[PDB]
Amino acid sequence: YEHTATIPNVVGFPYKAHIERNGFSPMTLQLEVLGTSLEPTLNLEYITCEYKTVVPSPYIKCCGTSECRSMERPDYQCQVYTGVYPFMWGGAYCFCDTENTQLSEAYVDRSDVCKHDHAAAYKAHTAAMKATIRISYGNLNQTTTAFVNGEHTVTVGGSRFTFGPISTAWTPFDNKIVVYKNDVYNLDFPPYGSGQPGRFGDIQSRTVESKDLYANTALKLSRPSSGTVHVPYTQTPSGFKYWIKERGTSLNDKAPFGCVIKTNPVRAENCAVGNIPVSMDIPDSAFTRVIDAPAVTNLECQVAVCTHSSDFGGIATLTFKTDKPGKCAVHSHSNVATIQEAAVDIKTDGKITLHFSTASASPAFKVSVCSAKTTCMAACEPPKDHIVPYGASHNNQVFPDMSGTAMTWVQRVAGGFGGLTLAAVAVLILVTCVTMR
Amino acid sequence: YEHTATIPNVVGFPYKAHIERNGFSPMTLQLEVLGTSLEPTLNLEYITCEYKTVVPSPYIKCCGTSECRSMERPDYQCQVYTGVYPFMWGGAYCFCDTENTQLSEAYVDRSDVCKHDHAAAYKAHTAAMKATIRISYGNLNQTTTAFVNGEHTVTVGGSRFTFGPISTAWTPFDNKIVVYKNDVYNLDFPPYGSGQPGRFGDIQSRTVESKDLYANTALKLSRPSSGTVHVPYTQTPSGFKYWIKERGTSLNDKAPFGCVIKTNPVRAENCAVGNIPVSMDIPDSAFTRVIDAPAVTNLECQVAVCTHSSDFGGIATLTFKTDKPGKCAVHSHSNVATIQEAAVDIKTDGKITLHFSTASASPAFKVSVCSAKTTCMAACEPPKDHIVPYGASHNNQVFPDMSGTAMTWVQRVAGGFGGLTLAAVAVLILVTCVTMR
Numbered sequence: 001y002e003h004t005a006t007i008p009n010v011v012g013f014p015y016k017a018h019i020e021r022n023g024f025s026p027m028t029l030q031l032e033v034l035g036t037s038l039e040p041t042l043n044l045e046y047i048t049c050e051y052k053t054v055v056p057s058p059y060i061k062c063c064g065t066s067e068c069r070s071m072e073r074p075d076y077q078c079q080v081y082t083g084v085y086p087f088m089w090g091g092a093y094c095f096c097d098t099e100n101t102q103l104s105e106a107y108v109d110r111s112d113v114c115k116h117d118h119a120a121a122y123k124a125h126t127a128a129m130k131a132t133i134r135i136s137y138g139n140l141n142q143t144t145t146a147f148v149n150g151e152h153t154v155t156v157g158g159s160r161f162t163f164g165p166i167s168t169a170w171t172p173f174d175n176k177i178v179v180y181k182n183d184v185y186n187l188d189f190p191p192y193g194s195g196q197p198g199r200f201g202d203i204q205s206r207t208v209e210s211k212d213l214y215a216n217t218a219l220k221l222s223r224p225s226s227g228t229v230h231v232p233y234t235q236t237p238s239g240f241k242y243w244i245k246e247r248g249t250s251l252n253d254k255a256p257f258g259c260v261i262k263t264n265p266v267r268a269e270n271c272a273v274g275n276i277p278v279s280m281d282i283p284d285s286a287f288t289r290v291i292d293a294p295a296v297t298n299l300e301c302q303v304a305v306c307t308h309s310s311d312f313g314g315i316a317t318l319t320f321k322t323d324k325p326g327k328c329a330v331h332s333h334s335n336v337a338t339i340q341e342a343a344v345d346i347k348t349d350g351k352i353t354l355h356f357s358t359a360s361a362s363p364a365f366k367v368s369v370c371s372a373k374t375t376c377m378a379a380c381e382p383p384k385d386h387i388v389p390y391g392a393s394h395n396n397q398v399f400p401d402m403s404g405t406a407m408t409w410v411q412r413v414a415g416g417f418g419g420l421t422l423a424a425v426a427v428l429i430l431v432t433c434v435t436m437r
Numbered sequence: 438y439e440h441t442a443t444i445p446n447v448v449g450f451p452y453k454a455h456i457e458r459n460g461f462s463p464m465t466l467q468l469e470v471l472g473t474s475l476e477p478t479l480n481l482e483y484i485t486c487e488y489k490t491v492v493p494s495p496y497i498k499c500c501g502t503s504e505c506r507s508m509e510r511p512d513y514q515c516q517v518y519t520g521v522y523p524f525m526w527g528g529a530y531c532f533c534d535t536e537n538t539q540l541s542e543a544y545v546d547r548s549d550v551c552k553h554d555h556a557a558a559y560k561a562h563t564a565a566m567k568a569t570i571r572i573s574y575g576n577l578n579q580t581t582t583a584f585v586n587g588e589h590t591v592t593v594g595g596s597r598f599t600f601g602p603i604s605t606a607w608t609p610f611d612n613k614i615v616v617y618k619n620d621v622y623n624l625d626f627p628p629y630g631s632g633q634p635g636r637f638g639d640i641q642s643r644t645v646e647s648k649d650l651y652a653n654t655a656l657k658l659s660r661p662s663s664g665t666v667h668v669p670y671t672q673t674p675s676g677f678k679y680w681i682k683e684r685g686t687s688l689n690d691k692a693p694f695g696c697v698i699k700t701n702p703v704r705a706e707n708c709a710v711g712n713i714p715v716s717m718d719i720p721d722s723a724f725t726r727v728i729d730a731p732a733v734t735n736l737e738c739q740v741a742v743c744t745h746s747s748d749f750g751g752i753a754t755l756t757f758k759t760d761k762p763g764k765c766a767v768h769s770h771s772n773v774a775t776i777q778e779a780a781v782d783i784k785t786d787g788k789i790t791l792h793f794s795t796a797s798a799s800p801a802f803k804v805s806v807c808s809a810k811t812t813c814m815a816a817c818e819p820p821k822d823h824i825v826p827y828g829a830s831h832n833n834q835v836f837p838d839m840s841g842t843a844m845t846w847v848q849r850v851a852g853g854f855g856g857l858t859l860a861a862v863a864v865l866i867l868v869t870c871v872t873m874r
């Protein structure tokens with residue numbers, strides 16, 4: 001038996017779902033949302049990490065003839081210097097002054113821990129979210145995991161469940177992002193095509209396959225000083241190191257809905273955005289018929305205290321003439337007030353205590369027993385005063401009953417102020433009709 | 438030196454891109470596009486393969502006590518029968534009748550060549566596309582490889598190029614597709630949750646690691662006949678084999694632009710749609726300056742025969758006084774007619790032959806030498822009666838020129854017929870100005 005329902009996509013909030021298929025005993029469904037996850041799609045444009053400037057020893061040859069060459073590995077600077085007069089601890093070496101040559105070369109290479117100390121970039125696409133849902137009812141209580149996509153199936157037991165599409169995807173991720181050892185950032189990194197020499201992405205190599213190490217580190221050489229042998233070069237500092245030293249504002253504390261983020265598959269957890277639909281079908285042999293426990297007759301309530309707004313403050317009592325005892329279900333039709341207990345046993349006395357909670361100062365809830373329903377209002381006067389850390393057990397809406405028992409005088413005085421004008425204008429219409437003649 | 442251009446996405450079509458910066462001789466670029474390849478995103482919902490019905494040998498026991506047990510393997514048919522009188526080669530076993538047990542059980546499992554003979558489902562989304570581009574200019578002719586995404590460099594050499602994003606992604610794929618041994622289909626599938634018993638995907642297993650082989654193949658058991666030992670089970674044939682048998686209508690023949698599909702990463706190649714923008718920058722020292730071979734003087738063009746529309750029938754003669762002979766650049770400003778010759782050598786005589794092509798019978802292409810420009814017109818009346826097997830090499834725009842030579846009489850007769858009524862309006866105006874008085 002199919003049936004549609006909607007649940008606010010919030011973790012740790014029990015949800016009620018009563019069934020009203022006549023010919024059988026009415027019953028209810030307990031729904032629990034536990035640890036939803038949202039796993040985006042990744043693209044892995046390029047990766048970056050540290051780098052070392054690899055330079056070999058300089059060459060000195062005592063003839064003075066020039067030797068120039070180039071090789072295809074990236075970022076070489078084929079510079080040759082003459083007129084060098086090098087020294088060394090043996091006073092000096094060779095003898096031909098003003099006739100000498102030095103060919104100093106250098107390049108860059110990725111870090112020795114490029115497989116471990118690397119930061120990666122990624123693209124963001126439309127994401128899919130999983131969920132773990134705990135379903136319970138009469139003599140059944142178990143959990144399951146579903147894709148909560150546009151269509152899926154649970155097969156939790158004799159019954160079956162389906163989850164509808166998500167109303168809106170207010171995902172924290174956007175466009176392109178960066179990840180670095182268990183944290184992410186919404187950095188607008190430069191493209192693979194070009195790189196600013198020093199800010200970020202100094203090397204723009206792809207995966208560790210180790211080919212085509214693009215780099216814009218921009219080495220610059222100079223003529224060595226007359227003192228002794230050197231390899232003078234100017235190298236901008238590692239932008240990746242600077243990005244480490246700055247970092248700041250890790251995205252984990254920037255989640256709009258407090259959506260904590262793990263990184264091993266890159267996903268998001270436990271944030272309450274929108275609401276989710278559900279459609280269920282139930283075998284008819286999953287619960288007893290109407291022949292068991294008809295215990296309604298006349299039904300009346302009594303309201304005691306409504307110390308509300310924290311967990312449950314609406315303590316109420318229900319009394320009624322009862323037949324032989326049995327399992328009977330109860331719920332509340334209005335969404336203003338929510339009760340906390342499912343079907344409960346009934347003794348022969350007829351007095352049963354129930355709890356609920358609501359922010360409304362004058363609740364007008366609609367109690368329904370497994371065969372009869374009645375209205376019952378409470379002067380929910382106690383306004384609490386705390387700052388509690390536990391969750392709420394009510395809808396965010398609040399509005400006093402139009403009928404009510406406190407704001408009645410305001411609406412009646414407004415109605416009287418309007419009715420005096422209405423009666424007077426009726427008198428005016430009658431008098432003008434008489435005088436028109 | 439940044440400059441922008443557009444290229445139609447037609448494979449095998451040389452493209453001429455002219456740069457006419459002052460202070461240097463104008464220069465021309467040859468553009469080639471070789472085998473584009475659009476690659477989509479894949480999601481891998483689940484898998485589908487054959488199913489084997491595994492049935493153990495039946496259990497016999499001559500005491501009458503039944504042993505019904507339930508396990509966690511899929512789609513058990515737990516049933517045991519009584520009143521069985523089995524027979525074998527030795528006639529029969531045991532003696533008791535009307536008090537016997539016959540236990541029969543069966544279940545389903547994935548196929549043996551599941552590792553190789555599987556079929557894959559995938560979800561498509563926004564897709565990137567790579568292109569191979571060959572660039573040529575003066576004494577430089579090399580291929581490239583760019584992702585032609587929103588922004589990315591090429592760096593073919595002294596110059597640098599960046600290919601812009603595609604206008605619209607008219608991907609042949611859509612939503613959900615199926616991959617099975619070198620062919621795809623635009624055929625939707627039931628979700629991973631539930632499936633129809635027999636049509637397709639009656640086995641909806643996840644990844645090949647053989648976990649939770651969900652089955653809805655509807656096994657049924659029956660009472661064995663009184664003759665001998667049996668195990669009567671009824672089962673619908675495998676939907677995977679039936680789907681292979683019917684197959685038909687491969688997607689490789691439904692490409693809306695003749696885009697051949699290769700399955701190893703699943704991409705679509707060699708198909709024309711839209712156009713590709715590009716930007717570039719060129720070093721100053723990549724060409725010559727104006728002081729080299731200025732020899733335009735005056736100019737005029739002639740045409741001998743202009744049988745057009747197939748490859749190139751527009752032989753044109755250009756003569757002009759010449760200075761010291763040398764190289765130069767030549768192209769056409771408009772696109773009504775297109776040429777094939779790149780920068781060409783110039784002799785002292787000045788007689789130069791050109792090959793061009795067009796569609797309309799009255800081209801108005803304006804030729805342009807690297808310093809001069811003169812209007813060229815021709816009466817390319819004669820078509821040719823063939824159905825060519827090779828590619829077209831000109832823009833599809835067919836339109837007689839505003840000036841023209843055959844449609845002029847239409848223009849003059851329309852102008853004259855307008856002139857009759859214009860002069861009639863004039864004479865009416867003079868008459869009414871006389872009579873207004």
Ligand SMILES: *[C@@H]1O[C@H](CO)[C@@H](O)[C@H](O)[C@H]1NC(C)=O
Pocket residue numbers: 136141142
């Ligand atoms: C359902 O079972 C869980 C343990 O798996 C338990 O904590 C919970 O209280 C049960 N629900 C009810 C309504 O008893």
Ligand SMILES: *[C@@H]1O[C@H](CO)[C@@H](O)[C@H](O)[C@H]1NC(C)=O
Pocket residue numbers: 467573578579
């Ligand atoms: C570029 O070089 C290839 C040889 O690999 C040649 O076939 C082609 O014609 C050259 N391009 C031009 C415009 O001549």
